Amino acid sequence: GEEMLVQALYDFVPQESGELDFRRGDVITVTDRSDENWWNGEIGNRKGIFPATYVTPYHS
């Protein structure tokens, strides 16, 4: 039962692999709460982990 989603507060451009890329205005569906500072989710055609401090818990 995971339906929570988050929203980016600023821009980000991960040049390393294993990170999830996106830009300001993007929304991500949190698939699970792997960590307290890192979460995982999917966004349209790509997925990966991202920093939890970089996002805000939007209203599911």
Domain count, the chain: 1
The experimental method, as deposited, was NMR
Record the tokens describing residue 47, joined without a space: 């997925």
3-state SS record for 2-60: CCCEEEECCCECCCCCCECCECCCCEEEEEECCCCCEEEEEECCEEEEEECCCEEECCC
> Which amino acid would we find at residue 32?
D
Residues 8 and 55: beta-carbon distance below 8 Å:
yes
User: 21-38: buried (b, 16+ CB within 10 Å) or exposed (e) per residue?
Assistant: ebeeebebebeeeeeeee
> Which amino acid would we find at residue 35?
D
| Residue linked to tokens 């988050």 | 6
Structural domain containing residue 27: 1-60
